[PDB]
Design a protein around this ligand. Structure first.
Ligand code: CHT
Ligand code: CHT
Ligand code: CHT
Ligand code: CHT
Ligand code: CHT
Ligand code: CHT
Length: 311
């Protein structure tokens, strides 16, 4: 807690001077918190700053050495008086834009008439990640917009919409950890179970993560694209074996007739069978294409209209 000082207005800026030295970075002054930057100019409004509390950026004055430290940056909101908004739940505030962030006391900037509901963590920074609100899950952006060299932290903390990947993020993305896919609706609601997006079907389960590969959902087997997740139908060559999935996407087992041709999908895994196989005591022969032989001979041996072997 900083004491023995005084706020001073000068040069269309504001400072906190004690013993004739300017205050810098974070300071607790009389039950309130302020951030005076690198040269002492008090900040107002939306600010993207290193997290306070470590002491490496706290209770410092312009006459002391500033230490090298690797601290994560986060969004904070200060009032027009310079006092930090110590909110830990939610609050409606002016939207974060390209022209109301990083301003100092004295600097006049347009007030965004657009107001948004921002959420805060227990340390007064804008919350990121998942949040539950009225029986639904929303995702607040963990990362800004990336570029070849450009990074815009402005979207951090905003309600995500559409296809969104959830990364493990501290200061940078952790590419060693998984990053599932989610879809937030036109109001940010996380989608669950089966959903049709852009004409194709996707399964999000009960947790919301997009499914990939084979998935057993309510007694049926489905195949979601191994990478893009969209549901497959019809004949599919997966794992060097053949499978037929209905228009509903449900895998087919047993006998199936495509037009006039008969195929047999193995009972267990539904893989198409070839060559000689036996169903309920009787024998059948299926060509390389999986098509069943009917009313013909196979190596001299005869099969009737049902494909059954007739001694
Ligand atoms: C992703 N949710 C927040 C919906 C559940 C935690 O896995
Ligand atoms: C649906 N995904 C976003 C997972 C892939 C399409 O780009
Ligand atoms: C399971 N789906 C919703 C994808 C199809 C139902 O016919
Ligand atoms: C996932 N299936 C069971 C459908 C095939 C693998 O055995
Ligand atoms: C079973 N195949 C997919 C090989 C042919 C039927 O279209
Ligand atoms: C074996 N088939 C399915 C082709 C006919 C049974 O009656």
């Amino acid at each position: 807690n900083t004491t023995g000082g005084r706020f001073v207005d000068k040069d269309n800026r504001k400072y906190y001077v004690k013993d004739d030295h300017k205050a810098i970075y974070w300071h607790k002054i009389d039950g309130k918190t302020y951030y005076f930057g690198d040269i002492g100019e008090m900040v107002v409004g939306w600010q993207y700053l290193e997290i306070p509390g470590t002491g490496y950026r706290d209770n410092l004055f312009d006459n002391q050495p500033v230490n090298e430290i690797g601290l994560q940056e986060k969004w904070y909101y200060f009032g027009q008086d310079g006092a930090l908004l110590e909110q830990t739940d939610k609050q409606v505030l002016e939207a974060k834009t390209s022209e109301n962030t990083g301003k100092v006391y004295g600097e006049q900037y347009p007030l965004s008439a657009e107001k948004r509901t921002y959420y805060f963590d227990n340390n007064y920074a804008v919350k990121t990640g998942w949040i539950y609100e009225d029986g639904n899950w929303y995702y607040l952006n963990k990362l800004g917009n990336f570029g070849d060299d450009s990074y815009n932290p402005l979207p951090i903390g905003e309600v995500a919409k559409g296809w969104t990947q959830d990364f493990h993020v501290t200061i940078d993305i952790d590419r060693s950890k998984p990053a599932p896919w989610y879809y937030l609706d036109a109001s940010g609601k996380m989608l669950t179970d089966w959903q049709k997006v852009n004409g194709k079907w996707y399964y999000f389960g009960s947790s919301g993560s997009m499914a990939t590969g084979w998935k057993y959902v309510r007694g049926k087997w489905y195949y979601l694209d191994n990478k893009n997740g969209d549901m497959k139908t019809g004949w599919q060559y997966l794992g060097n074996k053949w499978y037929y999935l209905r228009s509903s996407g449900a895998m087919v087992t047993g006998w199936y007739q495509d037009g006039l041709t008969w195929y047999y999908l193995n009972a267990g895994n539904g893989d198409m069978k070839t060559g000689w196989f036996q169903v309920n005591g009787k024998w059948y022969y299926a060509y390389s294409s999986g098509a069943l032989a009917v009313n013909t001979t196979v190596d001299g041996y005869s099969v009737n209209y049902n494909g059954e072997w007739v001694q």
